[PDB]
Curated annotation (Swiss-Prot):
Top-rank taxon: Eukaryota
The record's free-text note on cofactor binding: Binds 1 Fe cation per subunit. Ni(2+) and Zn(2+) can be used to a lesser extent.
Protein name per Swiss-Prot or TrEMBL: Cysteine dioxygenase type 1
UniProt EC number: 1.13.11.20
One cellular component term from this protein's GO annotations in UniProt: cytosol
Gene name of this polypeptide: Cdo1
Names of the cofactor(s): Fe cation; Ni(2+); Zn(2+)
Catalytic activity: L-cysteine + O2 = 3-sulfino-L-alanine + H(+)
Metabolic or biological pathway, per its Swiss-Prot or TrEMBL entry: Organosulfur biosynthesis; taurine biosynthesis; hypotaurine from L-cysteine: step 1/2
Entry's Gene Ontology molecular function annotations: cysteine dioxygenase activity; ferrous iron binding; nickel cation binding; zinc ion binding
Organism from which the protein derives: Rattus norvegicus
């Protein structure tokens, strides 16, 4: 039974219920994420920005089955074109807007990766991707407004691939946490 999360802490409690088992009801998880109305005071502790690139701030380690983190995107900060390592990936905007560009998996032949579509993700919206849907790039294209997003990955993963848009070639990268549970982790 899916109720509206009243606070971020309430959302986290609900997520622990939704991931108590071995499978994932994507539509339910996305609906509850969308229904939490971002309250900046509740997540300020995790919103630790870096001047030069976006940061990943761990909020909850889940039950072994999922990670929940907040990503903080300065003006003009963006990601690589990335996969998600055979995991579910949910992305909910907490502040600002992000552009999501979708790409197909490359062919073996070296070729430019042409976007299949793009969309603007707006405050409180929750998007979803997995490797069967494709690859994506996420960007804060704003010149004036930082963005903050809430990400849930299941299972957790700390490596993925970045893809060279000019060739489709991939390289494994390890993802690091800028902070964990509100504590900066250099
Ligand atoms: Fe992603």
């Amino acid at each position: 039974e899916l109720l509206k999360p009243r606070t971020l802490a309430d959302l986290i409690r609900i997520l622990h219920e939704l991931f108590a088992g071995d499978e994932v009801n994507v539509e339910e998880v996305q609906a509850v994420l969308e229904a939490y109305e971002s309250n900046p005071a509740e997540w300020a502790l995790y919103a630790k920005f870096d001047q030069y690139r976006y940061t990943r701030n761990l909020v909850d380690q889940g039950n072994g089955k999922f990670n929940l983190m907040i990503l903080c995107w300065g003006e003009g900060h963006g990601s690589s074109i990335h996969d998600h390592t055979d995991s579910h990936a949910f992305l909910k905007l907490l502040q600002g807007n992000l552009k999501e560009t979708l790409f197909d998996w490359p062919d073996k032949k070296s070729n430019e990766m042409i976007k299949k579509s793009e969309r603007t993700l707006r405050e409180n919206q929750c998007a979803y991707i997995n490797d069967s849907i494709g690859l994506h790039r996420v960007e804060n294209v704003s010149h004036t407004e930082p963005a903050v997003s809430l990400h849930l990955y299941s299972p957790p993963f700390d490596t993925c691939h970045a893809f060279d848009q000019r060739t489709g070639h991939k390289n494994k990268v390890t993802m690091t946490f800028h902070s964990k549970f509100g504590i900066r982790t250099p």
